[PDB]
Amino acid sequence: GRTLGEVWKERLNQMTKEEFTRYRKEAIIEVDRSAAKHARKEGNVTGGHPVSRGTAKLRWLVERRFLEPVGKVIDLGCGRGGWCYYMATQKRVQEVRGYTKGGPGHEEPQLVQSYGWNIVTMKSGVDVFYRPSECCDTLLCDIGESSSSAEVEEHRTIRVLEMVEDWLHRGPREFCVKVLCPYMPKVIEKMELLQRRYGGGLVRNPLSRNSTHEMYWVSRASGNVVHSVNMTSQVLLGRMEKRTWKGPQYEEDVNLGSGTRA
Numbered sequence: 001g002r003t004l005g006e007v008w009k010e011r012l013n014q015m016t017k018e019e020f021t022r023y024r025k026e027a028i029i030e031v032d033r034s035a036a037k038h039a040r041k042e043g044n045v046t047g048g049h050p051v052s053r054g055t056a057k058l059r060w061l062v063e064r065r066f067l068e069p070v071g072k073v074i075d076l077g078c079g080r081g082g083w084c085y086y087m088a089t090q091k092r093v094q095e096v097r098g099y100t101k102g103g104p105g106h107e108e109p110q111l112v113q114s115y116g117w118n119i120v121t122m123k124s125g126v127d128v129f130y131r132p133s134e135c136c137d138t139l140l141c142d143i144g145e146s147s148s149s150a151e152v153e154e155h156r157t158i159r160v161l162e163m164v165e166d167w168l169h170r171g172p173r174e175f176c177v178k179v180l181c182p183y184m185p186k187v188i189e190k191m192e193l194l195q196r197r198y199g200g201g202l203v204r205n206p207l208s209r210n211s212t213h214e215m216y217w218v219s220r221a222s223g224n225v226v227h228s229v230n231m232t233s234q235v236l237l238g239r240m241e242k243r244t245w246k247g248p249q250y251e252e253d254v255n256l257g258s259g260t261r262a
Ligand SMILES: Nc1ncnc2c1ncn2[C@@H]1O[C@H](C[C@@H](N)CC[C@H](N)C(=O)O)[C@@H](O)[C@H]1O
Pocket: 051, 052, 053, 054, 055, 076, 077, 078, 079, 080, 081, 082, 083, 084, 099, 100, 101, 102, 106, 107, 126, 127, 128, 129, 142, 143, 144, 145
């Protein structure tokens, strides 16, 4: 259909099992989680290992200044807690509150003791779509249930964005919101309006797998929404037609350290 994003989606759903798994990691940056996995088994809760691949993703963003976490942090759809625990290590942050659905099929928050864990409070069993908004200085959201249907994803992304705006009008100046399907017309229009009222821009995280078109709307980014999205659709589409396959590119999963913060 229209938009490069839609052709990408069509081509993805047409791949065989083996090519789909090969393609999703091609040329993306991927942190090694071996040590984190063995620490979980041995119960090593103070080794400083992140609880998921999510922290390395948020680190990429914060390290490039796409946002500057500060004050009270609320993390919607915290899952295991990768973003909460990473935010707990930032000096400007003083409180981290995470909410996640939990329950069968969903990740439960993992309680570990990486640096600043005492400032973190995660509550499971909370479907954020029904929870009235709360005040915060930094708002984070990483919700986006994928679907083979681009229309389903468009609807789910709009739902997220309308939910997120309820927390934004409260005052959070700093934010990072995952936009599951940014290429569909309704999300493009919704984002253009959201960008007018709250600034920021769409950024493609190189740690994301090629099997998802997800991009992050962060407060300290800018630029045309259509341009940014199409640019990403092109990179994703180009990775399907390579003749030389190099697989995922290694990067160390940085240690969060341990201890508590005053
Ligand atoms: N309606 C919802 N309300 C609250 N949480 C949700 C909802 N839908 C999905 N989720 C959670 O959102 C999470 C998405 C994850 N990718 C978050 C990972 C997290 N950012 C990390 O770094 O570890 C999942 O754990 C889902 O269970």
